[PDB]
Design a protein around this nucleic acid. Sequence first.
DNA 1: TACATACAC
DNA 2: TATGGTGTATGTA
Length: 433
Amino acid sequence: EGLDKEKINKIIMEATKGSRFYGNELKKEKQVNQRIENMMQQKAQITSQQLRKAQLQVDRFAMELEQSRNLSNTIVHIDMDAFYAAVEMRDNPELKDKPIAVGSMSMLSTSNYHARRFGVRAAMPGFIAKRLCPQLIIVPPNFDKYRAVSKEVKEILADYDPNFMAMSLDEAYLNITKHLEERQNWPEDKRRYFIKNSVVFGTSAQEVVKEIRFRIEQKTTLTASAGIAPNTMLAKVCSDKNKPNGQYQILPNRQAVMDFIKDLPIRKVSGIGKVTEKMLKALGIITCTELYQQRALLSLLFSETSWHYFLHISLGLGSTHLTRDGERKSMSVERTFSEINKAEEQYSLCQELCSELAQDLQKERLKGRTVTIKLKNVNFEVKTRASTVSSVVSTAEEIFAIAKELLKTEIDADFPHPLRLRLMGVRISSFPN
DNA sequence: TACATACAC
DNA sequence: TATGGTGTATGTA
Ligand SMILES: Nc1ccn([C@H]2C[C@H](O)[C@@H](COP(=O)(O)NP(=O)(O)OP(=O)(O)O)O2)c(=O)n1
Ligand SMILES: [Mg+2]
Ligand SMILES: [Mg+2]
Ligand SMILES: [Mg+2]
């Protein structure tokens, strides 16, 4: 079963239009459309002489990148399929051959592929999703299970790269280069696994990943998809290609890299989001070769780091070694609620959040100098207000002391109107080096 | 240092 | 009735 690609957007708009949420989404779209219009004003003021001057600067840098292109590493991205929903499907048979999503009626974490055919997706509210699919089954989340399932897969992955990078519970990057070296001359004993009556996997990168996905399915009863490529950026993209329950390899030769990139929409790259797509689209840029073609223009319209990034993407480049993410930069907590307008209640809720945050800091023995409150009113508009201090702070009292005054300032500023808020949050940052 | 925006899960 | 939460990067002032 399923729905129509056009029936869907009609039901969403019909369900969402008029809400305070939609009002804020319009306010954001206008703010983006204006930011596009400003970029187009600059494109008109760009001279053919400037374009030539930049083109010569870009290609000089592009040659520096191209000559340092590293194809000697083998990078695997593993990504669980419909992760949360797959777990709930695994442990309740009644949800076999049925559309489901994990979450509440207010919000969904994810949805299984059956339900995806109706247009129900991650980050969608349940009440909207039920309009799209009345038979939809919303099952409450069990994060503790998901963490436990994750732990099972992370244990398998550690055989192939002990320094693998877990991006989240369902997701990881592996550098299997060093494993492939050792494995080249392994006996069938060291790469044989029994079915839950046994099987052997080859010496190749494709085979190594078939073993990983198999061992995962055997240990957890859940499928994963995987991507294989000479860098992280490519690997991530490939893992999505034959999803669910499939692989893809970009072989480690320059030509194959380029063939894959040629007509690849830039959205699919990790870091190109909804906005960057819409901005670049207005410059006629959709695919990665179009992104290469316009590289000069981009070096005049965007900041150094952004066009440097776009160039890496346009040449099929990316990170080839996994850096153990070291010290953290911020710790935070925030919560949504039904409207709170009484000041005394807002101080109480601030104090609560500061306590929870101090508790989380205690766990990692951390102290910081910057305390930042986050306030979101009933029309979904967001303010952050910060304050940095000489001496590091950490206790619930110390953090609350600072956040109290920031919140006071904001209540005082709108006076005599009360703050009609729907979410508050507190963040700490500026830990010592 | 302060604030907003964009992005990822 | 209803649109969640944590963390990093970065552009600007
Ligand atoms: N916005 C989001 C995105 C994901 N998640 C959770 C639910 C997902 O199952 C899990 C992993 O994210 P994900 O890999 O992007 N999606 P999911 O594994 O469900 O489907 P696939 O597209 O990978 O098959 O994080 C969330 O709670 N909020
Ligand atoms: Mg996934
Ligand atoms: Mg994921
Ligand atoms: Mg993207």
